[PDB]
Design a protein around this ligand. Structure first.
Ligand SMILES: CC(/C=C/C(=O)NO)=C\[C@@H](C)C(=O)c1ccc(N(C)C)cc1
Ligand SMILES: [Cl-]
Ligand SMILES: [Cl-]
Ligand SMILES: [Cl-]
Ligand SMILES: [K+]
Ligand SMILES: [K+]
Ligand SMILES: [Mg+2]
Ligand SMILES: [Zn+2]
Length: 360
């Protein structure tokens, strides 16, 4: 359907990112095959040849310092040279981390791939893009790794984008991974130039990463007050109706009022139907509709960054549907909310109405 003036979608994927692995447990859910399966599905669905292929690169240590401490950079960098006993001991210093000799390099490639993709978008080489990267990023804090994440790819990309345009570039990060992006929240908690909106299974703080920082009443600090939006789910499985309602009532009104100039999606697919770690029911068509809504922001400048997601079929179908939307395909055809989901949405509305006229 696309013709000479149709917008272009970028895609980054590099099999080097498969080298990070759990050397003790080949069945750990954060598998190398996550990215190769998503990439394969893009070939099967004839999406790859429709995209402009963006190369990966490594992030530099100076770029990592946009968000991370010198200590954290140094320690993770040192893991490249460690023997298994030390890799095991180092990983045990963090919550839910495994490390191999290739982990640091893979984390650098995930970040650099997203920097290249943001650069392609912001220079107009492509309109939007998809980054099929691992390890994930959103639990990584300034000073520590966490939850399968070493460096905060999305947060770094936001800063990188500002560094190659202007400091005030308004970046929206929408984090639809089923888990709260604690690191992204904290990195930007005092920042009004980066709006963080997370939807996540919360369960009154019982669900990983197990902190009440993920609740709706954490709205940001100082100049960042209002610029941190947590949409926490309690009461078990949520799906398309709840996510569509959260987008309709919260994500899209706040985002439109913020008027981002770049949208980054921390696109985990662990809220997907079939995911045994998330336990939720978002369908591929649901993810397509979320993507299509975000495309209406920022003059279409959207970068979808893989985070979590552990059912290989589910993530492959879901991320492919997102790319299909970015490419301009028609959204697929797509109910009362769970009672607790209405409660959650109304709690966020109460918390953020003081800051966002679109909600009053
Ligand atoms: C860290 C995490 C999710 C991160 C994510 O997706 N962050 O966005 C999930 C942990 C709690 C988990 O559920 C788990 C389950 C099985 C397992 N093995 C079978 C080895 C190891 C860990
Ligand atoms: Cl193809
Ligand atoms: Cl050893
Ligand atoms: Cl390399
Ligand atoms: K999230
Ligand atoms: K913020
Ligand atoms: Mg600033
Ligand atoms: Zn997750």
């Amino acid at each position: 359907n696309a013709g000479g003036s149709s917008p272009i979608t970028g895609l980054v994927y590099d099999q080097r990112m498969m080298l990070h692995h759990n050397m003790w447990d080949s069945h750990h859910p954060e598998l190398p095959q996550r990215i190769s399966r998503i990439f394969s599905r893009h070939e099967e669905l004839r999406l790859l040849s429709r995209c402009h292929r963006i190369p990966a690169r490594l992030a530099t240590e100076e770029e990592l310092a946009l968000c991370h401490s010198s200590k954290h950079i140094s320690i993770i960098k040192s893991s490249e040279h460690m023997k298994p006993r030390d890799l095991n001991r180092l990983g045990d210093e963090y919550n839910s981390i495994f490390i191999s000799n290739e982990s640091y390099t893979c984390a650098l490639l995930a970040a650099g791939s997203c920097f290249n993709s943001a650069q392609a978008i912001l220079t107009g080489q492509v309109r939007n893009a998809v980054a099929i990267v691992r390890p994930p990023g959103h639990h990584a804090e300034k000073d520590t790794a966490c939850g399968f994440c070493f460096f905060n790819t999305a947060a770094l990309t936001a800063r990188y984008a500002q560094s190659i345009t202007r400091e005030s570039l308004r970046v929206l990060i929408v984090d639809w991974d089923v888990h709260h992006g604690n690191g992204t929240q904290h990195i930007f908690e005092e920042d009004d130039s980066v709006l963080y909106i997370s939807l996540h299974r919360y369960e009154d703080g019982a669900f990983f990463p197990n902190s009440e920082d993920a609740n709706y009443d954490k709205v940001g600090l100082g100049k960042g007050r209002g610029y941190n939006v947590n949409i926490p789910w309690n009461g078990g499985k949520m799906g398309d109706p709840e996510y569509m309602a959260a987008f309709h009532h919260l994500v899209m009104p706040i985002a439109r009022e913020f008027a981002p100039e770049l949208v980054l999606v921390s696109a985990g697919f662990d809220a997907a139907r079939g995911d045994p770690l998330g336990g939720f029911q978002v369908t591929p068509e649901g993810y397509a509709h979320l993507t299509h809504q975000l495309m209406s922001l920022a003059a279409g400048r959207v970068l979808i960054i893989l985070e979590g997601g552990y059912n290989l079929t589910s993530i492959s179908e879901s991320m492919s549907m997102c790319t299909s939307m970015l490419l301009g395909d028609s959204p697929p055809s797509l109910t009362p909310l769970k009672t607790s989901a209405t409660v959650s949405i109304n709690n966020v509305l109460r918390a953020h109405a003081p800051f966002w006229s679109s909600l009053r």
